[PDB]
Amino acid sequence: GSITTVLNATDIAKALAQCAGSFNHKTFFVTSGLTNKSDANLAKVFDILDQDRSGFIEVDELKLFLQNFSATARELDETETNAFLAAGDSDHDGKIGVDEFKAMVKA
Ligand SMILES: [Ca+2]
Ligand SMILES: [Ca+2]
């Protein structure tokens, strides 16, 4: 269901507080607990993040990434969104698919 059926709330809070100034997706994946979740749980998280059901996380959905973990979190800035996309977009189509998401969280 909600994100705390996947992750611990305390871990989410720490991951959010530590990126208030500067976000790094690898740091967040570790602190939040995403890095140790099963592939199937990461496909669950992908479904949450893909707000328009397009099958891909587009850049407008990446700007809103943190708001899937707490409704009142901040938007990512452009450098942060660009770096997120560049780390995960292995097929170079400008957006993140579910296999890309599962891979980038753990490899
Ligand atoms: Ca989408
Ligand atoms: Ca892609």
Short mmCIF file of N, CA, C and O and ligand atoms in Angstrom, two decimals:
data_model
loop_
_atom_site.label_atom_id
_atom_site.label_comp_id
_atom_site.label_asym_id
_atom_site.label_seq_id
_atom_site.Cartn_x
_atom_site.Cartn_y
_atom_site.Cartn_z
N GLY A 1 0.81 -1.20 0.00
CA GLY A 1 0.00 0.00 0.00
C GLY A 1 0.86 1.26 0.00
O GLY A 1 1.62 1.56 -0.93
N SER A 2 0.76 2.00 1.09
CA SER A 2 1.49 3.26 1.20
C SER A 2 2.99 2.99 1.27
O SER A 2 3.46 1.85 1.40
N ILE A 3 3.76 4.06 1.27
CA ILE A 3 5.21 3.85 1.27
C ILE A 3 5.72 3.20 2.55
O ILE A 3 6.76 2.55 2.53
N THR A 4 5.01 3.35 3.68
CA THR A 4 5.51 2.72 4.91
C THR A 4 5.10 1.26 5.01
O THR A 4 5.47 0.61 6.00
N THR A 5 4.42 0.71 3.99
CA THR A 5 4.35 -0.74 3.88
C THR A 5 5.60 -1.30 3.23
O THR A 5 5.78 -2.53 3.25
N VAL A 6 6.43 -0.42 2.66
CA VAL A 6 7.69 -0.81 2.03
C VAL A 6 8.88 -0.52 2.92
O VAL A 6 9.75 -1.37 3.09
N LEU A 7 8.92 0.71 3.47
CA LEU A 7 10.03 1.26 4.21
C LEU A 7 9.61 1.60 5.63
O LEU A 7 8.43 1.76 5.94
N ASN A 8 10.60 1.80 6.49
CA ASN A 8 10.35 2.29 7.84
C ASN A 8 10.24 3.80 7.86
O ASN A 8 11.06 4.50 7.24
N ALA A 9 9.26 4.29 8.63
CA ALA A 9 9.06 5.73 8.69
C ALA A 9 10.29 6.45 9.23
O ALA A 9 10.59 7.57 8.81
N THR A 10 10.99 5.83 10.18
CA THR A 10 12.13 6.51 10.78
C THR A 10 13.22 6.67 9.75
O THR A 10 14.00 7.65 9.79
N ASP A 11 13.36 5.68 8.86
CA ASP A 11 14.38 5.70 7.82
C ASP A 11 14.05 6.75 6.78
O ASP A 11 14.95 7.42 6.28
N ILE A 12 12.77 6.82 6.40
CA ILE A 12 12.30 7.86 5.49
C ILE A 12 12.57 9.22 6.07
O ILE A 12 13.15 10.07 5.39
N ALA A 13 12.25 9.44 7.35
CA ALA A 13 12.50 10.75 7.95
C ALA A 13 13.98 11.11 7.90
O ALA A 13 14.32 12.25 7.57
N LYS A 14 14.87 10.16 8.23
CA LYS A 14 16.29 10.49 8.20
C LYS A 14 16.76 10.76 6.78
O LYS A 14 17.53 11.68 6.54
N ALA A 15 16.29 9.97 5.83
CA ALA A 15 16.71 10.20 4.44
C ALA A 15 16.26 11.57 3.95
O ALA A 15 17.00 12.24 3.23
N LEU A 16 15.04 11.99 4.31
CA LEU A 16 14.54 13.30 3.90
C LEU A 16 15.32 14.42 4.58
O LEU A 16 15.67 15.43 3.95
N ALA A 17 15.56 14.30 5.89
CA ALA A 17 16.25 15.40 6.57
C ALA A 17 17.66 15.58 6.04
O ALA A 17 18.13 16.72 5.88
N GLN A 18 18.33 14.49 5.69
CA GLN A 18 19.72 14.64 5.27
C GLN A 18 19.85 15.19 3.86
O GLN A 18 20.94 15.62 3.48
N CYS A 19 18.79 15.17 3.05
CA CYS A 19 18.85 15.78 1.72
C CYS A 19 18.09 17.09 1.64
O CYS A 19 17.81 17.55 0.53
N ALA A 20 17.64 17.64 2.77
CA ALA A 20 17.00 18.95 2.69
C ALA A 20 17.84 19.95 1.90
O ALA A 20 17.31 20.78 1.16
N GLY A 21 19.16 19.98 2.13
CA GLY A 21 19.98 20.95 1.41
C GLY A 21 20.40 20.46 0.04
O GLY A 21 20.30 21.20 -0.93
N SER A 22 20.83 19.20 -0.03
CA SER A 22 21.47 18.61 -1.20
C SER A 22 21.07 17.15 -1.31
O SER A 22 21.34 16.38 -0.38
N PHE A 23 20.44 16.76 -2.41
CA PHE A 23 20.07 15.37 -2.61
C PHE A 23 21.07 14.61 -3.48
O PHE A 23 21.53 15.12 -4.51
N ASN A 24 21.31 13.36 -3.11
CA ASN A 24 22.13 12.44 -3.91
C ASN A 24 21.36 11.13 -3.94
O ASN A 24 20.99 10.62 -2.86
N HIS A 25 21.01 10.64 -5.12
CA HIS A 25 20.07 9.51 -5.15
C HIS A 25 20.67 8.26 -4.50
O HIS A 25 19.95 7.52 -3.82
N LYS A 26 21.97 8.01 -4.67
CA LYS A 26 22.55 6.83 -4.02
C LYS A 26 22.48 6.94 -2.50
O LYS A 26 22.21 5.93 -1.81
N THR A 27 22.77 8.13 -1.95
CA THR A 27 22.70 8.32 -0.51
C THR A 27 21.29 8.06 -0.03
O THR A 27 21.07 7.35 0.97
N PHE A 28 20.30 8.61 -0.75
CA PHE A 28 18.91 8.42 -0.36
C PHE A 28 18.51 6.95 -0.41
O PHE A 28 17.79 6.47 0.48
N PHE A 29 18.91 6.24 -1.47
CA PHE A 29 18.48 4.84 -1.58
C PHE A 29 18.97 4.04 -0.39
O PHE A 29 18.26 3.17 0.12
N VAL A 30 20.21 4.29 0.03
CA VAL A 30 20.73 3.59 1.21
C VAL A 30 19.98 4.02 2.46
O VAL A 30 19.48 3.18 3.23
N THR A 31 19.91 5.32 2.73
CA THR A 31 19.37 5.74 4.03
C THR A 31 17.90 5.34 4.18
O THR A 31 17.49 4.92 5.26
N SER A 32 17.12 5.55 3.13
CA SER A 32 15.70 5.20 3.13
C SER A 32 15.44 3.73 3.32
O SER A 32 14.33 3.36 3.74
N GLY A 33 16.38 2.86 2.93
CA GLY A 33 16.19 1.43 2.99
C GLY A 33 15.88 0.81 1.65
O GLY A 33 15.82 -0.43 1.55
N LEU A 34 15.67 1.64 0.61
CA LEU A 34 15.38 1.12 -0.72
C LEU A 34 16.43 0.12 -1.18
O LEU A 34 16.10 -0.88 -1.84
N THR A 35 17.72 0.37 -0.84
CA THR A 35 18.81 -0.44 -1.39
C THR A 35 18.75 -1.88 -0.98
O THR A 35 19.38 -2.72 -1.65
N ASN A 36 18.05 -2.19 0.10
CA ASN A 36 17.96 -3.57 0.56
C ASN A 36 16.59 -4.17 0.34
O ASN A 36 16.29 -5.23 0.89
N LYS A 37 15.75 -3.54 -0.47
CA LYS A 37 14.46 -4.14 -0.73
C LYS A 37 14.51 -5.11 -1.91
O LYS A 37 15.33 -4.96 -2.82
N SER A 38 13.62 -6.10 -1.89
CA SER A 38 13.51 -7.02 -3.04
C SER A 38 13.20 -6.28 -4.33
O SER A 38 12.63 -5.19 -4.34
N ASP A 39 13.60 -6.90 -5.45
CA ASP A 39 13.23 -6.37 -6.77
C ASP A 39 11.73 -6.15 -6.89
O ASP A 39 11.30 -5.13 -7.42
N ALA A 40 10.91 -7.08 -6.39
CA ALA A 40 9.46 -6.93 -6.48
C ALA A 40 8.98 -5.73 -5.65
O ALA A 40 8.09 -5.00 -6.09
N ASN A 41 9.57 -5.49 -4.47
CA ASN A 41 9.22 -4.28 -3.72
C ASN A 41 9.65 -3.03 -4.47
O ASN A 41 8.98 -1.98 -4.39
N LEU A 42 10.78 -3.10 -5.17
CA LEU A 42 11.16 -1.92 -5.96
C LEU A 42 10.20 -1.71 -7.12
O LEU A 42 9.93 -0.56 -7.48
N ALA A 43 9.60 -2.80 -7.67
CA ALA A 43 8.59 -2.57 -8.71
C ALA A 43 7.33 -1.92 -8.12
O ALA A 43 6.66 -1.09 -8.79
N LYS A 44 7.00 -2.27 -6.87
CA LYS A 44 5.94 -1.57 -6.12
C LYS A 44 6.24 -0.08 -6.01
O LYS A 44 5.36 0.77 -6.25
N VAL A 45 7.46 0.25 -5.60
CA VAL A 45 7.81 1.66 -5.44
C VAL A 45 7.74 2.38 -6.77
O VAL A 45 7.27 3.55 -6.85
N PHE A 46 8.16 1.69 -7.85
CA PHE A 46 8.09 2.25 -9.19
C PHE A 46 6.66 2.62 -9.55
O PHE A 46 6.40 3.71 -10.10
N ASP A 47 5.72 1.73 -9.22
CA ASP A 47 4.31 2.00 -9.50
C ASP A 47 3.83 3.25 -8.77
O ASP A 47 3.08 4.07 -9.35
N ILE A 48 4.26 3.44 -7.52
CA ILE A 48 3.91 4.67 -6.80
C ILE A 48 4.49 5.89 -7.51
O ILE A 48 3.79 6.91 -7.68
N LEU A 49 5.75 5.80 -7.93
CA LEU A 49 6.44 6.98 -8.50
C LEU A 49 5.87 7.37 -9.86
O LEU A 49 5.96 8.54 -10.27
N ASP A 50 5.36 6.41 -10.62
CA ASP A 50 4.85 6.65 -11.99
C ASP A 50 3.41 7.16 -11.88
O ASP A 50 2.43 6.46 -12.12
N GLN A 51 3.29 8.43 -11.53
CA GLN A 51 1.99 8.99 -11.16
C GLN A 51 0.99 8.98 -12.32
O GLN A 51 -0.22 8.81 -12.09
N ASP A 52 1.46 9.17 -13.56
CA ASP A 52 0.53 9.23 -14.68
C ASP A 52 0.33 7.89 -15.37
O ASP A 52 -0.36 7.83 -16.41
N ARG A 53 0.88 6.80 -14.81
CA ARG A 53 0.72 5.44 -15.32
C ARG A 53 1.27 5.25 -16.73
O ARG A 53 0.89 4.31 -17.43
N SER A 54 2.25 6.07 -17.13
CA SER A 54 2.83 5.99 -18.46
C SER A 54 3.74 4.78 -18.65
O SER A 54 4.06 4.45 -19.81
N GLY A 55 4.15 4.11 -17.56
CA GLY A 55 5.15 3.06 -17.65
C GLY A 55 6.55 3.54 -17.49
O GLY A 55 7.47 2.71 -17.51
N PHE A 56 6.75 4.85 -17.30
CA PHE A 56 8.08 5.41 -17.16
C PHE A 56 7.99 6.51 -16.13
O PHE A 56 6.96 7.18 -16.01
N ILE A 57 9.10 6.74 -15.46
CA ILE A 57 9.24 7.91 -14.60
C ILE A 57 9.87 8.99 -15.47
O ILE A 57 11.04 8.91 -15.83
N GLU A 58 9.07 9.99 -15.85
CA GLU A 58 9.57 11.12 -16.61
C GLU A 58 10.15 12.17 -15.67
O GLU A 58 10.05 12.07 -14.43
N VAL A 59 10.78 13.19 -16.27
CA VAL A 59 11.52 14.13 -15.44
C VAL A 59 10.56 14.89 -14.53
O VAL A 59 10.93 15.24 -13.42
N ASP A 60 9.32 15.13 -14.97
CA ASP A 60 8.42 15.85 -14.07
C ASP A 60 8.06 15.02 -12.84
O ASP A 60 7.86 15.58 -11.75
N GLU A 61 8.04 13.69 -12.98
CA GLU A 61 7.83 12.80 -11.85
C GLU A 61 9.09 12.66 -11.02
O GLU A 61 8.99 12.48 -9.79
N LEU A 62 10.27 12.82 -11.63
CA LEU A 62 11.47 12.78 -10.80
C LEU A 62 11.61 14.03 -9.95
O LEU A 62 12.06 13.95 -8.80
N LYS A 63 11.20 15.18 -10.48
CA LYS A 63 11.23 16.40 -9.68
C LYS A 63 10.41 16.24 -8.41
O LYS A 63 10.72 16.86 -7.39
N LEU A 64 9.37 15.42 -8.46
CA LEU A 64 8.47 15.18 -7.35
C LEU A 64 8.80 13.89 -6.57
O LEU A 64 8.02 13.49 -5.70
N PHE A 65 10.00 13.34 -6.79
CA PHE A 65 10.36 12.04 -6.22
C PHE A 65 10.13 11.97 -4.71
O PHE A 65 9.56 11.00 -4.21
N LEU A 66 10.64 12.96 -3.97
CA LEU A 66 10.58 12.88 -2.51
C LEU A 66 9.16 12.94 -1.98
O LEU A 66 8.93 12.47 -0.86
N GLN A 67 8.22 13.52 -2.76
CA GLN A 67 6.85 13.67 -2.28
C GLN A 67 6.08 12.35 -2.26
O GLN A 67 4.98 12.30 -1.69
N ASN A 68 6.63 11.31 -2.86
CA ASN A 68 6.10 9.96 -2.74
C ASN A 68 6.46 9.33 -1.41
O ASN A 68 5.82 8.33 -1.04
N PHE A 69 7.44 9.89 -0.69
CA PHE A 69 7.86 9.38 0.61
C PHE A 69 7.30 10.19 1.76
O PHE A 69 6.99 9.63 2.83
N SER A 70 7.12 11.51 1.55
CA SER A 70 6.37 12.34 2.48
C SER A 70 5.68 13.41 1.66
O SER A 70 6.35 14.11 0.90
N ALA A 71 4.36 13.53 1.82
CA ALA A 71 3.60 14.44 0.98
C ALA A 71 4.12 15.89 1.00
O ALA A 71 3.98 16.60 -0.01
N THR A 72 4.73 16.32 2.09
CA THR A 72 5.18 17.70 2.27
C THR A 72 6.68 17.90 1.99
O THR A 72 7.20 18.99 2.25
N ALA A 73 7.38 16.89 1.46
CA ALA A 73 8.81 17.07 1.15
C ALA A 73 9.00 18.08 0.01
O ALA A 73 8.07 18.44 -0.71
N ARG A 74 10.26 18.48 -0.18
CA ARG A 74 10.56 19.47 -1.22
C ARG A 74 10.67 18.83 -2.60
O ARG A 74 10.88 17.61 -2.74
N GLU A 75 10.56 19.67 -3.61
CA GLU A 75 10.90 19.28 -4.99
C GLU A 75 12.40 19.14 -5.14
O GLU A 75 13.18 19.87 -4.51
N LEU A 76 12.82 18.22 -6.03
CA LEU A 76 14.22 18.21 -6.45
C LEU A 76 14.51 19.38 -7.38
O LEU A 76 13.62 19.85 -8.11
N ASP A 77 15.74 19.87 -7.34
CA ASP A 77 16.12 20.91 -8.29
C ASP A 77 16.57 20.26 -9.62
O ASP A 77 16.58 19.04 -9.77
N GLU A 78 16.89 21.11 -10.61
CA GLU A 78 17.20 20.59 -11.94
C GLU A 78 18.48 19.77 -11.96
O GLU A 78 18.54 18.73 -12.63
N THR A 79 19.55 20.24 -11.29
CA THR A 79 20.78 19.45 -11.23
C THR A 79 20.51 18.07 -10.62
O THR A 79 21.05 17.04 -11.07
N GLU A 80 19.69 18.03 -9.58
CA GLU A 80 19.39 16.76 -8.90
C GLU A 80 18.55 15.85 -9.79
O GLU A 80 18.81 14.66 -9.90
N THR A 81 17.55 16.42 -10.47
CA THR A 81 16.75 15.62 -11.38
C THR A 81 17.59 15.12 -12.55
O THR A 81 17.54 13.93 -12.90
N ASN A 82 18.47 15.97 -13.09
CA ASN A 82 19.33 15.57 -14.21
C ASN A 82 20.25 14.43 -13.82
O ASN A 82 20.49 13.49 -14.60
N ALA A 83 20.86 14.54 -12.63
CA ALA A 83 21.78 13.49 -12.19
C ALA A 83 21.06 12.19 -11.95
O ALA A 83 21.62 11.12 -12.20
N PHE A 84 19.85 12.25 -11.37
CA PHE A 84 19.03 11.05 -11.17
C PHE A 84 18.76 10.37 -12.51
O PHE A 84 19.01 9.18 -12.69
N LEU A 85 18.27 11.15 -13.48
CA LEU A 85 17.98 10.60 -14.80
C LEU A 85 19.23 10.01 -15.43
O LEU A 85 19.19 8.89 -15.96
N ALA A 86 20.37 10.70 -15.33
CA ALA A 86 21.58 10.21 -16.00
C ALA A 86 22.11 8.93 -15.38
O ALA A 86 22.70 8.10 -16.09
N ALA A 87 21.89 8.73 -14.08
CA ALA A 87 22.36 7.53 -13.42
C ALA A 87 21.54 6.32 -13.85
O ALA A 87 22.07 5.20 -13.93
N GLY A 88 20.26 6.53 -14.12
CA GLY A 88 19.37 5.40 -14.30
C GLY A 88 18.99 5.15 -15.74
O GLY A 88 18.56 4.04 -16.04
N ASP A 89 19.09 6.16 -16.63
CA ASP A 89 18.55 6.05 -18.00
C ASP A 89 19.55 5.35 -18.92
O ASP A 89 20.14 5.93 -19.84
N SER A 90 19.68 4.04 -18.71
CA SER A 90 20.71 3.30 -19.42
C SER A 90 20.35 3.11 -20.88
O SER A 90 21.26 2.92 -21.71
N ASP A 91 19.07 3.16 -21.24
CA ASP A 91 18.75 3.01 -22.65
C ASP A 91 18.60 4.36 -23.35
O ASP A 91 18.25 4.39 -24.52
N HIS A 92 18.91 5.46 -22.67
CA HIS A 92 19.04 6.78 -23.29
C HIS A 92 17.74 7.26 -23.94
O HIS A 92 17.78 7.96 -24.96
N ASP A 93 16.60 6.95 -23.35
CA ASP A 93 15.34 7.45 -23.91
C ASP A 93 14.77 8.64 -23.13
O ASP A 93 13.69 9.13 -23.48
N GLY A 94 15.51 9.15 -22.13
CA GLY A 94 15.10 10.35 -21.45
C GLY A 94 14.22 10.13 -20.24
O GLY A 94 13.76 11.12 -19.66
N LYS A 95 13.96 8.88 -19.87
CA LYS A 95 13.01 8.56 -18.81
C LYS A 95 13.46 7.24 -18.19
O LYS A 95 14.34 6.56 -18.72
N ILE A 96 12.87 6.88 -17.05
CA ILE A 96 13.31 5.71 -16.28
C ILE A 96 12.20 4.67 -16.33
O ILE A 96 11.07 4.95 -15.90
N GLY A 97 12.50 3.50 -16.89
CA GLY A 97 11.59 2.36 -16.83
C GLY A 97 11.83 1.49 -15.59
O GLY A 97 12.76 1.69 -14.81
N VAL A 98 10.96 0.49 -15.41
CA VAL A 98 10.99 -0.23 -14.13
C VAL A 98 12.27 -1.05 -13.99
O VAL A 98 12.85 -1.13 -12.91
N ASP A 99 12.74 -1.67 -15.09
CA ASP A 99 13.99 -2.40 -14.98
C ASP A 99 15.13 -1.45 -14.65
O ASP A 99 16.01 -1.79 -13.85
N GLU A 100 15.14 -0.27 -15.28
CA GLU A 100 16.19 0.71 -14.96
C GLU A 100 16.16 1.11 -13.50
O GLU A 100 17.21 1.34 -12.88
N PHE A 101 14.95 1.27 -12.96
CA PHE A 101 14.82 1.71 -11.58
C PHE A 101 15.35 0.64 -10.63
O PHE A 101 16.14 0.93 -9.74
N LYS A 102 14.90 -0.61 -10.82
CA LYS A 102 15.38 -1.70 -9.99
C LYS A 102 16.90 -1.81 -10.07
O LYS A 102 17.57 -1.97 -9.05
N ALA A 103 17.48 -1.66 -11.27
CA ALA A 103 18.93 -1.81 -11.42
C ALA A 103 19.68 -0.68 -10.71
O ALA A 103 20.67 -0.92 -10.02
N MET A 104 19.21 0.56 -10.88
CA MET A 104 19.97 1.67 -10.34
C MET A 104 19.92 1.73 -8.83
O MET A 104 20.83 2.29 -8.20
N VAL A 105 18.88 1.17 -8.23
CA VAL A 105 18.84 1.22 -6.79
C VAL A 105 19.90 0.30 -6.21
O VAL A 105 20.53 0.63 -5.19
N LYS A 106 20.21 -0.82 -6.91
CA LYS A 106 21.12 -1.83 -6.34
C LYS A 106 22.42 -2.04 -7.09
O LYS A 106 23.31 -2.71 -6.56
N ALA A 107 22.58 -1.49 -8.29
CA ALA A 107 23.82 -1.69 -9.07
C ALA A 107 24.24 -0.43 -9.84
O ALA A 107 23.43 0.48 -10.02
CA CA B 1 5.04 8.45 -15.74
CA CA B 2 15.24 4.88 -20.05
#
